[PDB]
């Protein structure tokens, strides 16, 4: 359950948290994938869906290799395959406070760098064989083309470039520069190619070279420097290169015993071998990427160790895309003419002049003297300067140090002793204020985050440059377009939008002070708006989510929450004979009541087969019910005609959780029940002659209990609310699992 | 009217 890991296996998989369900809000993940020194990392998104935003400013995935940085959201990374330039690939993921999608499933893979990005040092000793691997079977050859790129360090009279020895060990093909220079040794004969190349071309610049041969003519072909050459080696028409041999880089050549210090010194690249000898027309359509027919420059064909492989030859970033790159430098200079000049003008113009002598657009944007010490002569000071260099409009520090170190003569008597240059540090990722999570940023980048919690507009923060000691700092956030939880003003037109956003935040771990602000806004929303089903389904799950909060979080907000659910049920407009609104800890229901034919009613709360949410039976007592409410047939009997025409509906609520009904004046009695509510309108029917049968299931077992039937009286404890016993007695059907109440009011 | 059982 950890998403800040370092993954070191050869291949594997990782997902966003809770994939394939939705990720949680406010995530911050850092999967760093590390391979050893000769490998790169390839990732592949197997699946990807994030919350979309302009500039990916809500939820984003950043993919970081050694040279680039790119942010992704929406669906845009879904079929993608990305490749690290070094051996480390880092994948970040950040979600904000609301709106979650599915996330992602990424496969990672350690991939070796290709042999065609590597040159190979050939050895000086033996028992260091750099051979074609035994995965490859070298056929019988009566014709071949071999091409490679060769380059050298030192010179020697006898040196070998490749060696094919047979299954018994004696050499049968070798290209080696000899007593007579450049020669192809074939079978037992010597075919000199010296008129078309020799060892004066073992330059340290690489150059391609092709050698061809056929048995049938004896025709050696040489391709070098764009020109094709031909020569007949008539001795070579006797020989056939047999199967199953050992082809190796450098190697023994035309020697009987040893290869020990009998090899060329240098680099080789792109060694390939073919079954046929190529024409000059065929040798001119030969790119360096074409696969060799027997041996190709590709790691599956060779056993070459890592010790002999080198290498040669809107805004997309989540950090921001600034116009200028900034550097801070520390210059140590020696002035031998301290009383004459001001060295800051001379140093800054030398600084401006030196970068423009290498055609770089780097300029000084600020410089000041930090330390001045005389030395032995009183007119010679060592002066320490702090300077801001700015790179104008480019997509390394040690190169800036070396262009300055290679020009120490600043002015006459002015001399650079030391310089260090540091790239100016990014502003770190930082949460200020709470729910405003600002990502890491380059200097002068402004970042935008959503306004908590409605996200209608943005806030912004800028990573600024302190122009005194040339370090970066976060400026203050501009939250001027942002609204509080409380400060929005609800309308009929924005009520659906407000309720949806507050329903998102309430799944998260909220503070107790945020929770009473959500429940006050829900009360304003339920009061001003007209309520249909989809608006009430959002409001019931704000209240269901505050029911799984801590008991101290609910306690200040519970009476507003209870009163807002109560008025939502009075105001809800529905079309059928009944409407039920369910959630995890709260189901509320309305059904229509005919006051002419009212012969009584039984209503019931239950949870069905592999359902996690409770439902409402309006007609019967459902099987294994958690709450049953039976209304007597004489319920409307003592009602006036003015009251009986205000009776349209039956209301029913089942509270799966009890944290909204806390009572600290209970004499230590704990509430061991669900809470069920019922009513028939905006008024309470009192002093009935036949009671309401309220049966509620207990939370826990209690053998021979002493139950007290209570109702929630909103007038108790200075109009805050408490349980009240008045009117409610225990019926005779109560056991250890259920309690039946007969209450005389509803 | 919300109903509970105290024990
Ligand atoms: C990500 O993790 C790696 C290894 O734990 C660490 O070196 C790197 O600095 C981390 N970066 C961020 C931005 O968390
Ligand atoms: C590395 O990634 C790119 C996609 O950007 C892909 O085209 C390329 O083939 C990959 N490299 C290898 C060796 O497969
Ligand atoms: C260094 O270059 C900047 C870039 O235009 C310029 O404004 C500044 O005046 C130059 N400094 C000196 C001492 O000429
Ligand atoms: C919020 O920022 C995005 C870019 O990140 C921009 O497209 C949009 O116009 C901004 N909206 C407001 C209200 O500032
Ligand atoms: C606030 O709104 C104004 C006008 O709509 C806009 O110009 C400004 O950039 C916004 N501020 C932020 C931080 O988005
Ligand atoms: C110098 O840098 C430090 C940290 O980098 C910062 O706290 C301090 O305020 C800076 N000095 C000035 C004068 O701003
Ligand atoms: C947000 O709430 C605070 C709470 O004291 C209030 O003072 C402030 O005026 C509200 N914000 C706005 C922009 O009205
Ligand atoms: C709910 O009522 C509002 C107005 O009170 C109306 O605009 C909206 O279409 C209704 N929605 C549904 C799903 O009935
Ligand atoms: C019920 O009565 C109270 C005041 O007695 C009022 O605030 C509330 O809006 C009424 N309910 C409906 C649905 O009108
Ligand atoms: C209700 O009505 C019945 C019959 O009409 C009567 O006997 C009873 O006393 C009345 N009860 C109250 C509380 O008004
Ligand atoms: C209900 O009672 C039965 C025995 O009558 C018992 O097995 C069961 O555990 C009880 N259930 C609860 C939730 O107390
Ligand atoms: Ca989100």
Range of the domain at A281: 116-310
Write b or e for each residue in A350-360: b if 16 or more Cβ atoms lie within 10 A of its Cβ, otherwise e: bbeebbeeeeb
Interface test with B, best of A683, A739, A740 (most B CBs within 10 A): A739
CB contact under 8 A, B4 and A696: yes
Q: Are A316 and A357 in contact (CB under 8 A)?
A: no
Tell me, rounded to whole angstroms, the distance of Cα A208 from its chain centroid: 44
CA of A484 to the centre of ligand 7 (A): 7
CA atoms within 13 A on the CB side of A298: 15
Do residues A52 and A156 both lie within one domain?
A: no
Range A725-729 contact pairs with CB under 8 angstroms and sequence separation of 24 or more: A728/A694, A728/B3
Dist CA A191 CA A218 (whole Å):
9
List the one residue out of A543, A575, A495 whose CA is nearest residue A677.
Answer: A543
Do residue A590 and residue A676 come from a single domain?
yes
Q: How far apart are CA A232 and CA A26, in angstroms?
A: 77
Q: Which two tokens stand for residue A122?
A: 């050939």
Instruction: Pick from A637, A688, A746 the residue to mutate for probing ligand 10's pocket: most ligand atoms within 8 Å of its CB.
Output: A637
Contacts by residues A522-529 (CB-CB < 8 Å, ≥ 24 positions apart): A522/A560, A522/A561, A522/A564, A523/A560, A523/A563, A523/A564, A524/A490, A525/A490, A525/A495, A525/A498, A525/A499, A526/A564, A526/A567, A526/A568, A526/A571, A527/A567, A528/A490, A528/A491, A528/A492, A528/A495, A529/A490, A529/A491, A529/A492, A529/A495
- Token match 């009944």: residue? A578
A108 near A43, Cβ under 8 Å? yes
Residues A130 and A102 in one domain: no
Same domain, A49 and A144: no
CATH of the domain at A48: 2.60.120.290
What is the total residue count of chain A? 746
Cis peptide before A479 (omega within 30 of 0): no
Distant-in-sequence, close-in-space partners of A611: CB < 8 Å, separation ≥ 6: none
Determine the residue of chain A that is closest to B3 in CA distance: A711
**Helix spans in A481-591 (H):** 495-505, 512-528, 533-546, 551-571
Cα A196 from Cα A182, distance rounded (Å): 9
- Count chain A–chain B contacts defined by CB atoms under 8 A: 75
| Count of alpha carbons within 13 angstroms of residue A463, beta-carbon side | 26
Q: What angle do CA A65, A70, A71 make, to 5 degrees?
A: 135
As given in the structure block, the two tokens for residue A593 are: 């009541």
Tokens of A338: 């301290």
Residues A84 and A207 in one domain: no
Give the residue from A252, A262, A243, A246 showing the smallest Cα distance to A303: A246
Identify any residues that bridge with A246 across adjacent strands, giving them in sequence order: A165
A164 with A296, same domain? yes
Beta strands in A6-77 (DSSP E): 6-7, 11-15, 28-34, 39-49, 60-64, 69-72
A680 and A664 housed in the same domain: yes
A622 cis-preceded (ω within 30 degrees of 0): no
The Cα-based distances of A554 to A273, A544, A587, A613, A658 in angstroms read 79, 11, 18, 21, 10
> What one-character DSSP code corresponds to residue A397?
H
d(CA A275, CA A137): 12
CATH number at residue A163: 2.60.120.200
Residues A8, A123, single domain; the answer is no
Q: Measured in whole angstroms, how far is the alpha carbon of residue A178 from the centre of its chain? A: 59
- Are A88 and A146 contained in the same domain? no
Q: Ligand 10: residues within 6 Å at CB?
A: A 637-638, 687, 689
Query: Using an 8 Å Cβ cutoff, are A424 and A444 in contact?
Result: no
| H or E stretch at A388 | strand A381-392
* Same domain (yes/no): A159, A110: no
- Looking at chain A, after which residues does the C atom sit over 2.5 Å from the next written N, breaking the chain? 313, 395
Enumerate residues 6+ apart whose C-beta is below 8 A from A437.
A26, A28, A94, A96, A429, A431, A449
Beta strand residue intervals within A194-259, DSSP E: 207-214, 219-224, 227-232, 246-249
Residue A255, CA atoms < 13 Å, CB-side half-sphere: 21
* CATH number for the domain that contains residue A687: 2.60.220.50
Identify whether residues A66 and A128 lie together within a single domain: no
- Residues A116, A113: Cα–Cα separation, whole Å: 8
Burial of A494 (0-12, 13-18, 19+ CB in 10 A): middle
Nearest to A29 by CA among A14, A42, A11, A41: A14
Closest ligand 5 atom number to CA of residue A481: 1
C-beta of residue A63 within 8 angstroms of C-beta of residue A25: no
Q: Distance of CA A358 to CAs A15, A351, A402, Å?
A: 47, 12, 12
Q: For residue A677, give the nearest of B1, B5, B7 by CB distance.
A: B1
Nearest to A392 by CA among A368, A420, A356: A356
- Compute the distance between CA of residue A321 and CA of residue A570 in angstroms, rounded to an integer: 55
- Could you tell me if A133 and A251 lie in one domain? yes
Closest CA to A480 of A506, A448, A525: A448
């Amino acid at each position: 359950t950890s998403c800040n890991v370092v993954l070191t296996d050869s291949q594997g998989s990782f997902t966003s948290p809770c994939y394939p369900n939705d990720y949680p809000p406010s995530q911050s993940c850092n999967w760093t994938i590390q391979a050893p020194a000769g490998f790169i990392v390839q990732i592949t998104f197997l699946d990807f869906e994030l919350e979309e935003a302009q500039g990916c400013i809500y939820d984003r995935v950043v993919v970081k290799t050694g040279t680039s940085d790119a942010k992704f959201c929406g669906l845009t990374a879904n079929g993608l395959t990305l490749n690290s330039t070094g051996n480390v690939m880092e994948v970040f993921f950040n979600s904000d406070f609301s709106v979650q999608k599915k996330g992602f499933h990424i496969s990672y893979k350690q991939v070796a760098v290709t042999l065609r990005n590597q040159k190979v040092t050939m050895p000086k000793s033996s028992k260091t064989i750099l051979r074609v691997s035994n995965s490859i079977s070298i056929p019988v050859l009566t014709a071949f083309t071999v091409c490679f790129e060769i380059a050298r360090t030192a010179q020697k009279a006898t040196e070998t470039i490749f060696t094919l020895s047979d299954a018994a060990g004696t050499s049968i093909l070798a290209f080696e520069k000899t007593s007579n220079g450049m020669e192809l040794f074939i079978g037992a004969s010597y075919c000199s190619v010296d008129n078309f190349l020799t060892s004066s071309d073992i330059t340290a610049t690489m150059k391609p070279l092709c050698l061809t041969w056929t048995k049938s003519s004896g025709l050696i072909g040489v391709y070098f420097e764009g020109h094709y050459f031909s020569s007949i080696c008539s001795a070579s028409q006797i020989y056939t290169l047999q199967s199953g041999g050992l082809l190796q880089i450098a190697g023994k050549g035309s020697s009987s015993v040893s290869v020990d210090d009998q090899n060329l010194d240098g680099f080789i690249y792109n060694f390939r071998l073919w079954d046929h000898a190529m024409l000059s027309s065929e040798l001119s359509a030969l790119t360096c990427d074409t696969v060799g027919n027997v041996v190709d420059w590709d790691h599956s064909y060779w056993t070459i160790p890592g010790s002999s492989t080198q290498t040669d030859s809107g805004c997309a970033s989540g950090l921001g895309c600034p116009e200028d790159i900034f550097y801070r430098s520390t210059l140590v200079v020696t002035d031998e003419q301290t009383p004459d000049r001001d060295a800051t003008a001379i140093i800054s113009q030398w600084l401006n002049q030196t970068f423009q002598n290498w055609m770089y657009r780097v300029y000084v944007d600020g410089i000041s003297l930090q330390l001045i010490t005389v030395l032995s002569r009183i007119t010679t000071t060592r002066q320490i300067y702090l300077a801001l260099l700015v790179y104008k409009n480019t997509t390394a520090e040690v190169e800036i140090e070396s262009m300055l170190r290679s020009a120490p003569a600043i002015g006459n008597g002015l001399t650079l002793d030391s310089v260090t240059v540091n790239l100016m540090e990014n502003c770190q990722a930082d949460e200020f204020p709470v729910h405003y999570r600002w990502p890491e940023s380059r200097p002068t980048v402004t970042q935008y985050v959503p306004c908590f919690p409605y996200k209608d507009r943005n806030a912004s923060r800028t990573c600024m440059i302190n122009r005194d000691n040339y370090t970066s700092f976060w400026a203050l956030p501009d939250r001027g377009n942002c609204t509080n939880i409380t400060s929005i003003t609800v309308s009929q037109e924005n009520a659906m939008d407000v309720a949806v956003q507050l329903a998102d935040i309430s799944n998260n771990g909220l503070s107790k002070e945020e929770l009473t602000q959500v429940v006050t806004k829900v009360m304003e929303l339920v009061n001003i708006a007209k309520i249909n089903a989809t608006l009430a389904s959002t409001v019931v799950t704000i209240i269901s989510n505050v029911m799984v909060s801590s008991e101290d979080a609910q306690k200040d907000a519970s009476e507003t929450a209870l009163k807002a659910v109560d008025e939502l049920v009075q105001k809800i407009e529905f079309d059928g004979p009944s409407l039920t609104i369910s959630s995890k800890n709260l189901v509320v229901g309305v059904s229509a009541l005919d006051t002419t034919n009212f012969n009584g009613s039984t209503l019931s709360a239950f949870i069905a087969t592999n359902t996690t949410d409770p439902q409402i039976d309006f007609d019967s007592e459902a099987h294994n019910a958690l709450a049953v409410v039976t209304l007597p047939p004489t319920l409307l009997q003592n009602l006036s005609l003015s009251q009986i025409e205000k009776v349209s509906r039956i209301n029913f609520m089942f509270f799966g959780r009890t944290g909204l009904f806390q009572d600290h004046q209970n004499n230590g009695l704990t509430l061991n029940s669900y809470v069920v509510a019922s009513s028939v309108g905006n008024f309470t029917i009192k002093n009935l002659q036949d009671p309401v049968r309220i049966e509620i299931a207990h939370l826990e077992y209690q053998k021979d209990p002493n139950p007290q039937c209570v109702f929630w009286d909103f007038n108790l404890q200075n109009y805050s609310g408490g349980w009240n016993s008045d009117g409610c007695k225990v019926g005779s059907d109560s056991n250890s699992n259920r309690t039946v109440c007969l209450c005389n009011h509803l | 009217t919300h109903f509970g059982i105290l024990m």
